[PDB]
């Protein structure tokens, strides 16, 4: 250390001639013992190189070799320093990168080189990705974008654009985001891109622009709307005059799709429905439509003649907005009729398919019939063509759209029935074609479900003999046929179908086991067939209940108040039942006889067990078979043998961990097993089938799975830095290990309901030591994944966990959050996963010493997060997470008996803290608190709260909203603040009849004081009056 520093100082103090060889001496001076003792610093050697560079640059074209040499020298030094861990501080390195490229004295190759190390090291490491401050991000974006705007054009312009893309992503993901005043910079770049033809970095500039609009979509919506009206005409000109680069076209389409989503949130058409309308936008949309109509007739727009999905989706969105120069379905019909080749016909068929699917109301019922003749005419060609699946899909969508309408006339309905009968006749022949099997069965199922064509005796022959193989679309059509029709008795037809479904070749696995099927579909079909009235069982079986920019669009509708979530015993045939039981045991016996310990697949055996427990679950759901006799039934006896045979594969893998080919099979094993279980507590065949599967599992199998869990737990391009929670850090073993652990997690929570052979306590205890402080390493990407999912799956509100388990579960939470404090994405994920603990922490029945310990441990980390959030250290995404988890705290303890967080020695109630977020700086946070404020007026466990508590909660919320109003171009913010206040009042009025009079008076005062929109408030009061039950608004006004 001291000797190295002395040698470096002597070399630095030496003359230039001695420095010629001292550079190599210093480079070779580094050694393994030197780096080991140097770890702490690196700033000392860094500034020695800093002044060495600044001294050398002071003293023609001959210097172009020296500047390249020193650039390589610093590249090697930085790589060696950061090879193991990033000890070097990003701050001083960033400033040097700033000042080496700001000046024009340095060569172009040097700034290009300096940008290379900057991207490959600073922006490729998560540590530097988080520690770069907001001020650094803005200055980092500004200097390189001006360099991009510089008139000099070189090969490095692509690299500079890649820097700009990475900086924009970093600022929009790690900080609060750069100001909207930089939008003029992008406008100038687009204007410059209009003149220049090279467009070297236009792909990254537009992609960075797309990210900025996505991040800046919550606020300044009109400003984004106005800028869209400015750049889109230039983008249309760029598209026409460019060479049509595939990557540039894709990002342009993404920008166009983002603009339409902003202007028309979730397909809004009129201005009063939440859409934004202007003359420039209408002309732009018409001009945008003309370009895409021209572009579809191109070879590169798609051997494959299918137009890309993004084009199809963008096509339907534009058509829906422009449908009412005159435009409509007439041009679509003309194109379909006049198209003689599938090249110019498949795109339009895909266009109509997506428009009908996305917007059922976009197609008038008058044009429904003319489209039906066109589709029928395009169906037959005496053979099978490329357009056939497309014609089948749109016909299915037409049938689905037809079934959703009840205003059709009698004459129109009769014409449609005759047309659909003709459609059914055409599509029935040629069913043997396997290529269009999925589309044909889907069309038949849709027609059968809608009762468009009456079923005939010939259709029932399809599921007989070897006419067709058991497939998912075939079963989906069959279950709809059994639901809306009665099986003819041609004891024979029902028997024949059950042979076809359970046809096993006397070494090929049956297709039902070979291919995955939706849970409890074949089982319900079989049970319904065996009992007296197959139609009745389907109706009763289906009667049971079941367990991006979209969030931004939902925000706009709630902003415009067009969307508001609030204020809104049987008999069985004995012969058929015995026949099915004989077939199930016969199929199972065949599987065991053909089973081998090495070559036979295991997921087929579990699928057979899933089918076997499914029919038993369906049988136990009715009064035909009780649970007690189902346990001793020969089916259940075959069930345990299937798993026991499949259990040895896990046992073998427990010893042969190094095997990799087994991983793919075992990963499929849990996916079947995990989906077998059902955590929902309602009485349903899914719950009964899950209970049978739980009772199947033995004590030997859990220990093998747990032992494999313990064994694998001890093992050891992208624009910017890689998220530590990304799936690319998870290998096959890592992905596998997360799989059965989730299977173990679901087993523990749901096994206690029934009586099982295995002890769930032992698994849970073993799971606790899996995150033991000595063993668990939060810095490891794998170890982070388990603790997050264990925090998500183990807690359960129904039956509280052993309360010593949760404190051990919550023990590493403080350490994990402290290590990942600077990572916004990890903090948001941790907060979203920790809220599941509150459902068990709320119940204070066993209020003991350790009970108050776990509550204190949970409250201090939440209080630290709230304090750190108040210090402006978290992004908006974390702010919802803090709001969301605190909402669960409010739900768990409405009276705040124990939910009191302590910070700097001061106690802050949870209820009082929630009202603070109503005056936040992010528009998305404000309504989420405004929508979730209803927890302060009702128990949410629907009993009301005490009068005094309700009065002070409403008063505190109203004054905070008023404070947010008064702490104020600005029109967007003004409209944003008004929407939150109106949403706050509307929610209070709906959920709090106690404060109905006070809230109404508060709105009345706010009309003249806060300047609320008279039309917006009038619509709200009409809606709540409709919700309450008042026929007219005047009566509900007159009541108060």
UniProtKB/Swiss-Prot annotation:
Location in or out of the cell: Nucleus; Cytoplasmic vesicle; Cytoplasm, Cytoskeleton, Microtubule organizing center, Centrosome; Peroxisome matrix
Stated consequence of mutating residue 511 to L: Found in a patient with familial pancreatic cancer; uncertain significance
PTM text: Phosphorylated by NUAK1/ARK5. During the late stages of DNA damage response, dephosphorylated following deacetylation by SIRT7, leading to ATM deactivation. Acetylated in vitro by KAT5/TIP60. Deacetylated by SIRT7 during the late stages of DNA damage response, promoting ATM dephosphorylation and subsequent deactivation.
Phenotype when changing residue 265 to L: In AT; decrease phosphorylation of target proteins; increases protein abundance
Effect after changing residue 482 to V: No effect on phosphorylation of target proteins
Expression (tissue specificity): Found in pancreas, kidney, skeletal muscle, liver, lung, placenta, brain, heart, spleen, thymus, testis, ovary, small intestine, colon and leukocytes.
Effect the entry attributes to changing residue 922 to L: In AT; uncertain significance
Coiled-coil segments: none
Result for mutant: residue 303 to C: In a colorectal adenocarcinoma sample; somatic mutation
Stated induction or repression of this protein's expression: By ionizing radiation.
Stated role: Serine/threonine protein kinase which activates checkpoint signaling upon double strand breaks (DSBs), apoptosis and genotoxic stresses such as ionizing ultraviolet A light (UVA), thereby acting as a DNA damage sensor. Recognizes the substrate consensus sequence [ST]-Q. Phosphorylates 'Ser-139' of histone variant H2AX at double strand breaks (DSBs), thereby regulating DNA damage response mechanism.
Similarity comment: Belongs to the PI3/PI4-kinase family. ATM subfamily.
Domain remark from Swiss-Prot or TrEMBL: The FATC domain is required for interaction with KAT5.
Medical condition linked: Ataxia telangiectasia: A rare recessive disorder characterized by progressive cerebellar ataxia, dilation of the blood vessels in the conjunctiva and eyeballs, immunodeficiency, growth retardation and sexual immaturity. Patients have a strong predisposition to cancer; about 30% of patients develop tumors, particularly lymphomas and leukemias. Cells from affected individuals are highly sensitive to damage by ionizing radiation and resistant to inhibition of DNA synthesis following irradiation.
Protein's name in the database: Serine-protein kinase ATM
Species of provenance: Homo sapiens
Lineage of origin: Eukaryota, Metazoa, Chordata, Craniata, Vertebrata
Gene this chain is encoded by: ATM
């Amino acid at each position: 250390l001291n000797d190295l520093l002395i040698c470096c100082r002597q070399l630095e103090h030496d003359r230039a001639t001695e420095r010629k060889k001292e550079v190599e001496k210093f480079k070779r001076l580094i050694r393994d013992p030197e780096t080991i003792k140097h770890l702490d610093n690196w700033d000392a050697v860094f500034r020695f190189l800093q002044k060495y560079i600044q001294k050398e640059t002071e003293c023609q074209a001959s210097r172009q070799k020296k500047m390249q040499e020193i650039s390589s020298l610093v590249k090697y030094f930085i790589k060696c320093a950061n090879r193991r861990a990033p000890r070097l501080k990003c701050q001083e390195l960033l400033n040097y990168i700033m000042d080496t490229v700001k000046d024009s004295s340095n060569g172009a190759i040097y700034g290009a080189d300096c940008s290379n190390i900057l991207l490959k090291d600073i922006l490729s490491v998560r540590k530097y990705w988080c520690e770069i401050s907001q001020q650094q991000w803005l200055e980092l974006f500004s200097v390189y974008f001006r360099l991009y705007l510089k008139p000099s054009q070189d090969v490095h312009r692509v690299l500079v654009a890649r820097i700009i893309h990475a900086v924009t992503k970093g600022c929009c993901s790690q900080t609060d985001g750069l100001n909207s005043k930089f939008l003029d910079f992008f406008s100038k770049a687009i204007q410059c891109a209009r003149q220049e033809k090279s467009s070297s970095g236009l792909n990254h500039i537009l992609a960075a622009l797309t990210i900025f609009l996505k991040t800046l979509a919550v606020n300044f919506r009109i400003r984004v709307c106005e800028l869209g009206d400015e750049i889109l005409p230039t983008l249309l000109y760029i598209w026409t005059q460019h060479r049509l680069n595939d990557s540039l076209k894709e990002v342009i389409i993404e920008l166009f799709q983002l603009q339409i989503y902003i202007h028309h949130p979730k397909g809004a058409k009129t201005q009063e429905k939440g859409a934004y309308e202007s003359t420039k936008w209408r002309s732009i949309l018409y001009n945008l439509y003309d370009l895409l109509v021209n572009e579809i007739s191109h070879i590169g727009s798609r051997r494959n003649i299918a137009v890309k999905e993004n084009l199809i989706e963008l096509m339907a969105d534009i058509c829906h907005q422009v449908f009412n120069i005159e435009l409509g379905w007439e041009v679509i019909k003309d194109h379909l009729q006049k198209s003689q080749n599938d090249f110019d016909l498949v795109p339009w068929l895909q266009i109509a398919t997506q428009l009908i699917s996305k917007y059922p109301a976009s197609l008038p019922n008058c044009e429904l019939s003319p489209l039906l003749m066109i589709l029928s005419q395009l169906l037959p060609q005496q053979r099978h063509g490329e357009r056939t699946p497309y014609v089948l899909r749109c016909l299915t969508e037409v049938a689905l759209c037809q079934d959703k309408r009840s205003n059709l006339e009698s004459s129109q309905k009769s014409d449609l029935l005759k047309l659909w009968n003709k459609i059914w006749c055409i599509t029935f022949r040629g069913i043997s074609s396997e290529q269009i099997q999925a589309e044909n069965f889907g069309l038949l199922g849709a027609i059968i479900q809608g009762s468009l064509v009456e079923v005939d005796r010939e259709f029932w022959k399809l599921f007989t003999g070897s006419a067709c193989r058991p497939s998912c679309p075939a079963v989906c059509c069959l279950t709809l046929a059994l639901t809306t029709s009665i099986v003819p008795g041609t004891f024979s037809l029902k028997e024949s179908i059950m042979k076809w479904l359970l046809f096993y070749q006397l070494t090929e696995v049956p297709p039902i086991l070979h291919s995955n099927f939706p849970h409890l579909v074949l089982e319900k079909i079989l049970v319904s067939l065996t009992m007296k009235n197959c139609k009745a069982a389907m109706n009763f079986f289906q009667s049971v209940p079941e367990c991006s920019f979209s969030e931004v669009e939902e925000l706009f509708l709630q902003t415009t108040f067009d969307k508001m979530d609030f204020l809104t015993g049987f008999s069985v045939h004995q012969n058929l039942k015995e026949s099915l039981d004989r077939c199930l045991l016969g199929l199972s016996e065949q599987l065991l006889n053909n089973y081998s310990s090495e070559i036979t697949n295991s997921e087929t055996l579990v699928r057979c067990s899933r089918l076997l427990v499914g029919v038993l679950g369906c049988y136990c759901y009715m009064g035909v078979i009780a649970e007690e006799e189902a346990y001793k039934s020969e089916l259940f006896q075959k069930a345990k043998s299937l798993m026991q045979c499949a259990g040895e594969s896990i046992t073998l893998f427990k010893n042969k961990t190094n095997e990799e080919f087994r991983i793919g099979s075992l990963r499929n094993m849990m996916q079947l097993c995990t989906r077998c279980l059902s955590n929902c507590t309602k009485k349903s065949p899914n719950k009964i089938a899950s209970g049978f599967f739980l009772r199947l599992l033995t004590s030997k199998l859990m220990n093998d799975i747990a032992d494999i869990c313990k064994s694998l737990a001890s093992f050891i391009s992208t624009i910017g830095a890689i998220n530590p929670l990304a799936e690319e850090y998870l290998s096959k073993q890592d992905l596998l290990f997360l799989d059965m652990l989730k299977f173990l997690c679901l087993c523990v929570t749901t096994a206690q309901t029934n009586t099982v052979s295995f002890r769930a306590a032992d698994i849970r205890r073993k799971l606790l030591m899996l995150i033991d402080s000595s063993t668990l390493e939060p810095t490891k990407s794998l170890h982070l994944h388990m603790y997050l999912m264990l925090l998500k799956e183990l807690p359960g509100e129904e039956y509280p966990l052993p309360m010593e388990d949760v404190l051990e579960l919550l023990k590493p939470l403080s350490n994990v959050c402290s290590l990942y404090r600077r990572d916004q994405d990890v903090c948001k994920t941790i907060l979203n996963h920790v809220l599941h603990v509150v459902k068990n922490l709320g119940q204070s029945n066993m209020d003991s010493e350790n009970t108050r310990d776990a509550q204190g441990q949970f409250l201090t980390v939440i209080g630290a997060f709230w304090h750190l959030t108040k210090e402006r250290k978290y992004i908006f995404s974390v702010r919802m997470a803090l709001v969301n988890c605190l909402k669960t705290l409010l739900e768990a303890d409405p009276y705040s008996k124990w939910a009191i967080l302590n910070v700097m020695g001061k106690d802050f109630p949870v209820n009082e803290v929630f009202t603070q977020f109503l005056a936040d700086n992010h528009h998305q946070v404000r309504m989420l608190a405004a929508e979730s404020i209803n927890r302060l007026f009702q128990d949410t466990k629907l009993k009301a709260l005490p009068l005094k508590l309700q009065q002070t909660a409403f008063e505190n919320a109203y004054l905070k909203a008023q404070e947010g109003m008064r702490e104020m171009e600005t029109l967007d913010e003004i409209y944003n603040r008004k929407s939150v206040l109106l949403t706050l009042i509307a929610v209070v009025l709906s959920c709090s009849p106690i404060c109905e009079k006070q809230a109404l008076f508060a709105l009345c005062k706010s009309v003249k004081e806060n300047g609320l929109e008279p039309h917006l408030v009038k619509k709200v009061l009409e809606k709540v009056s409709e919700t309450f039950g008042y026929r007219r608004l005047e009566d509900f006004m007159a009541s108060h």
